[PDB]
Amino acid sequence: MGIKHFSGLFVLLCIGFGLSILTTIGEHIV
Amino acid sequence: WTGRFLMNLWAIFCMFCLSTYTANLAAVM
Amino acid sequence: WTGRFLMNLWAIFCMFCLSTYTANLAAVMVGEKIYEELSGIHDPKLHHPSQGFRFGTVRESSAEDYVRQSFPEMHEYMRRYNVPATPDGVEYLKNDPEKLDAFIMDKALLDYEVSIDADCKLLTVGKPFAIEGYGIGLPPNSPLTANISELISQYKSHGFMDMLHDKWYRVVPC
Amino acid sequence: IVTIHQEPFVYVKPTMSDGTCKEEFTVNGDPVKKVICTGPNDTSPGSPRHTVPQCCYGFCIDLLIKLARTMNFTYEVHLVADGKFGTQERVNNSNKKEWNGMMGELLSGQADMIVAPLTINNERAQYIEFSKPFKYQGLTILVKKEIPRSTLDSFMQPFQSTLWLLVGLSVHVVAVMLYLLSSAMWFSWGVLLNSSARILGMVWAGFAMIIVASYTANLAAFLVLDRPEERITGINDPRLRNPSDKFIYATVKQSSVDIYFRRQVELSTMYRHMEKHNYESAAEAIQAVRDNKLHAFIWDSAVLEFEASQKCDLVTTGELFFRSGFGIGMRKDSPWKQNVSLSILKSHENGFMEDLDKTWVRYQEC
Amino acid sequence: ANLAAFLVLDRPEERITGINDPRLRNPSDKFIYATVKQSSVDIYFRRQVE
């Protein structure tokens, strides 16, 4: 978790959480 | 072949990825 | 419930043990693989006794005189473990070398003894130091010196020295 | 004669009970001779209490015994009331700057010889006469035998220490977000232990695997750079060159090392840094180092190396900077100028010095 | 662990220190090093018997 690696991991986690929320909403739509 | 060949390929890929990540971290540090 | 927590604790301990074992193995693999990099007489390895270096030369050759005249303490230190004759020292290298593990001496003879060593379990190391020459012993102010000197100089000029050299100076891959 | 307590050169052992000297047998079991001394038995040079005789022997004493069996001169030995190796010093009315300790105790004119490991140097040779040296040395440096504290200790000291808090916070946030129960918490914990909803679970599993791999790599990288042990290269190490507070280093006062640093130019601030904590005895500094008080004890070779090989906690690394030879002192042109030199040189050639060295300087640590 | 240790061996045996080195004093067949024919360097290396 050294500076850039930790920042990239956190950004990827946030992006994945948002994408998962969007995909769950879309799946619930249909 | 549910796991006769696909499971072996996945295990080989995972082991190679782990070894490569370990080597990359060792080289970086 | 509680069994899940116990299994999680066991798994955490297993992961920590695996990481520790990997780190220990990685550190160990970086250990002694280029051992005995003496590099010459200026290093802390050979200069002051780090509890277990056993030096040795010929008893009063040019090695002993030069060492005792330049660096005194090593005169005593070698002399407690100093062998009398050359065609003995390397033999102690075959004695599970706790007795002799260094035989400071002229590099030419050392290279020859490496060449004849078919087993090839020895490697000369350390940069050359205290370069000297050879000659022919004559009494003080004796005659004939000029004749022999010019003769050997001419033989060197024509290459007779190299003739004798490649007649006797062989090479073996080590 | 006057001698200073220095091991393994002279031993100080109190007399037993009635006044007899305890008998001792060496490694060979042969008798080891000893003589009687008088000095400040009380304590450090403070209150001068009783001065009961003690038993003395070692490396110098038997040398004097052999030196005395020839020229057959009767002798008595007594230590020095000061306890320092006779250097120069001034007073509150400094107009003479006389000699303290050993040299002054001989220079003032109530003793005959000096039998002790005193380094010969220029100004001493100017004011006093020496003989042919019988031992050569050069002063090295020592330090504690590192520290074996690396045993599952850096649980949260791998530089950045936010690993556990970050992992727990991320796991809790992911579990809360996925909560759309105790079973769910157990499943999330297993995701951290490898014990729509399906897509979110797969993404969380991939994230947990990536986090585990990254944590393993970080632990490996942290536990691959634990190799240190600077060990001090010599007096040219910049770390000791700059005077800092966490790496204090000093040397016994009023001795050869202090005069050698105080006279040679090199620099001044190093002498200033060393003068702060210069000790007052020869051996107590070793106990201070062994405790933890000092980390670099600058002192001459033979005694330092023997102490290092005595107790398996102190080792020396360096290049043996500066060189000199121990002598045997005596007054300015005493009638004993020649015979001591002749005997010492005959012994040096003969090999008796080798016998003494092997007898009283041997190895036990390894 | 062994793979990481082997991969850690980077920039090994790729640089030469100087005129004095085990590679220089005794090559066998693979480490040929040479210069240009009878130029200033040639007589210098021939001359100094040191």
Author numbering:
A (entry chain B): 926 to 955
B (entry chain B): 740 to 768
C (entry chain D): 740 to 913
D (entry chain A): 400 to 579, 603 to 617, 628 to 798
E (entry chain C): 649 to 698
Question: How did the manuscript describe this experimental structure?
Answer:
N-methyl-d-aspartate (NMDA) receptors (NMDARs) are ionotropic glutamate receptors (iGluRs) that mediate most of the excitatory neurotransmission in mammalian brains. NMDARs are formed from two obligate GluN1 subunits and two of any GluN2(A-D) or GluN3(A-B) subunits. The GluN1-3 (A or B) NMDAR emerges as an exception, distinguished by its distinctive ion channel activation mechanism, which relies exclusively on glycine and does not involve glutamate. In these NMDARs, glycine binding to GluN3 promotes channel opening, whereas glycine binding to GluN1 triggers rapid desensitization.
We next sought to determine the structure of GluN1a-3A NMDAR in complex with glycine, an agonist that binds to both the GluN1a and GluN3A LBDs. We hypothesized based on the electrophysiological observation that prolonged exposure to 1 mM glycine during protein purification would promote a desensitized state. The ATD heterodimers are also highly mobile and only weakly resolved, indicating that the high degree of ATD mobility of GluN3A-containing receptors occurs independently of ligand occupancy within the LBD layer. We could resolve additional density of the TMD compared to the CNQX-bound structure, which allowed unambiguous registering of the GluN3A M3′ and M4′ helices. Second, the glycine-bound structure of GluN1a-3A NMDAR exhibits a pronounced conformational change within the LBD heterotetramer where the GluN3A LBDs undergo ~80° clockwise rotation when viewed from the extracellular side. This robust GluN3A LBD rotation shift occurs around an axis orthogonal to the membrane plane. The inter-Glu776 distance in the glycine-bound GluN1a-3A NMDAR is substantially shorter (23.5 Å), and its orientation differs from others, indicating little or no tension in the LBD-M3′ linker. Consequently, the channel gates are closed in both glycine-bound and CNQX-bound GluN1a-3A NMDAR structures. We hypothesized that the unique subunit arrangement of the GluN1a-3A NMDAR bound to glycine could reflect a desensitized state. This inference arises from the observation that the LBD-M3′ loop tension is minimal, and the channel pore remains closed, despite the LBDs adopting the close-cleft conformation induced by glycine binding.
